[PDB]
Subunit: 220 residues, 2 copies
């Protein structure tokens, strides 16, 4: 059963989790359970293995494995099993993945494909990601930044940082064109960075010169 | 002449009228010439290069006269007629670079960016991209537009040495201006009205007020406040 995997996961023993996932996947292969089956007991077990795979993959920033497990788990959801306690988080993670890769059409297709639409308000993870996507698309970057700063879902950290980097590049790209200079403090606010040293790092990355606390944007 | 042994009909009078900038006379001459093209079955390109060149030349003058008289419908019509003559083996006229550039500039001005690039892929002699001043300038313009290089676009347009491109200059500037304004909205909370006019490459304080209204900005005490 999955009690032991749950324990390993709870202790954040990711290396043991991966070894247990291998053991369980070998069992799935022996029983022909990689693809969903009408036998709900066995389908649920397989689904649950792949859910832990999604979670262990994000915890170890293994995005290749994440995307493989995500593709394996979602087909189990598009049938009639009792959702596990992980379903909202996994659904949320998959949506946020698509957002982080700017796969916006695929994101909205994924929402359309969600059997029960009430999920969008009932489940806090899915609700949060839907709101983040709306705020990004509307260019409400204050709200994006506030949502990402105050996010209470640790599992979203990896992808949220990618989203925030995309927003920050877009702001940075506008700024370097419509300013000739800006003080470091103002730029730190503008870019939703935490402090001016963070801004100094971004300035170096982008080729901006800083002199006496003022950023000068490359021109003519 | 180009149409027939004893014919007195050729392009010399149109070429005179064009250099005189007598655009109304040019239009009347173009209609005369097109009537004769119809009588001779020369609207459609023919393997007879003498005749095809004559018909092509009429349509090229049509392109040029149409843009001089601010007439985009006629311009687009004539452009659609002339380009098929280019996709065969005539010796290019002195107008071919300018016409090709105008067609490209038109597609850019309408944000028909896919068609812009298809049109470049269609140009038989791709050395034209570097050799011809008109085509080279438009290619550079479109590149700077795509990359969002606002100040380069503005500077190219401000120093353009090709009067025949004048029609499209403010149109392309408005495309870029939109983008600048979207940027300014994102990264400013306020700016003096006068600094906004300069940032946006606008002509005066009043045009900025209209743009303000159009985009929903507020102005007070000579200052713009962004939503």
């Amino acid at each position: 059963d999955l009690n032991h995997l749950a324990d390993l996961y709870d202790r954040k023993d990711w290396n043991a989790c991966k070894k247990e996932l291998l053991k369980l996947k070998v069992e799935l292969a022996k029983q022909n359970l990689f693809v969903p089956t009408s036998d709900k007991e066995k389908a649920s077990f397989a689904r649950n293995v792949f859910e832990y795979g999604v979670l262990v993959s994000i915890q170890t920033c293994d995005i290749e494995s994440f995307a493989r497990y995500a593709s394996q788990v979602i087909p189990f959801y598009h049938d009639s099993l009792v959702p596990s306690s992980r379903m909202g988080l996994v659904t949320g993670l998959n949506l946020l993945y698509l957002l982080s890769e700017n796969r916006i059409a695929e994101f909205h297709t994924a929402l359309e494909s969600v059997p029960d639409k009430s999920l969008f308000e009932r489940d806090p993870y899915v609700e949060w990601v839907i709101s983040l996507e709306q705020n990004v698309m509307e260019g409400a970057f204050d709200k994006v930044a506030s949502m990402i700063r105050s996010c209470n879902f640790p599992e979203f950290s990896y992808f949220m940082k990618i989203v925030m980097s995309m927003v920050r590049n877009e702001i940075a790209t506008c700024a370097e064109k419509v300013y000739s200079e800006i003080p470091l403090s103002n730029a730190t606010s503008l870019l939703y960075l935490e402090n001016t040293k963070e801004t100094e790092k971004l300035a170096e990355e982008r080729g901006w010169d800083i002199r006496d606390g003022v950023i000068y944007f490359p021109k003519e």
